[PDB]
Amino acid sequence: GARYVRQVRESDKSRLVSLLIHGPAGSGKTALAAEIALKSGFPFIRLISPNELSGMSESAKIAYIDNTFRDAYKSPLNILVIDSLETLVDWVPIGPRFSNNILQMLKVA
């Protein structure tokens, strides 16, 4: 994580770096991501979590996501933590059921 942070800091052509942190349930992924982000020491850091979106409607959620991603296009250095991707799209394996709108929005974001 520290190496990736340094690389994004220094390189002048790599203007977008994305990571995936996958593993078995209960393994402690969010703690590690938060630790890396904190120790990085960047001016601008944000986090998107399921807790913040509870009770809202689909349009409100999309609006919130778009606003948060737009707030990050200022300043010359930024960090964003997206938590538990699969529960942001309301996944359940019986159908399977999920939300195509939010998924497509994230895929384009």
Partner: protein, 108 residues
């Protein structure tokens, strides 16, 4: 069910269910920190204890019904709710052992 209370508050949640398999299929069994189990009645002495507590046996009835169901039913498994309902409905007509025996045999 996985949100911590603000500041320094505390919370205990107890949720019941009867469709464990469905919850397993929905993949929602990771929100719980432990799992208690409640089994059925599986013995005659337990039925006797329920009877003494419900004021129905009158001693002789206890003996007659227990003796009848000892050989009239090899396997016995019923919940408390249905047992209490069966006792109550048996009380009205033919307080003798017969009615309870039929009710218990058919219910099990």
């Amino acid at each position: 069910l996985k949100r911590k209370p603000p500041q320094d508050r505390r919370l205990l949640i107890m949720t019941t269910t009867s469709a464990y398999s469905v919850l397993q299929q929905m993949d929602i069994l990771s929100c719980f920190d432990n799992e208690i189990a409640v089994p059925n009645m599986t013995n005659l002495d337990e039925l006797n204890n329920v009877m003494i507590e419900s004021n129905f046996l009158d001693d002789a009835g206890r003996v007659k019904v227990i003796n009848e169901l000892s050989r009239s039913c090899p396997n016995f498994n019923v919940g408390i709710k249905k047992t209490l309902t069966n006792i109550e409905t048996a009380r009205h007509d033919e307080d003798p052992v017969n009615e309870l025996v039929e009710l218990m045999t058919q219910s099990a």
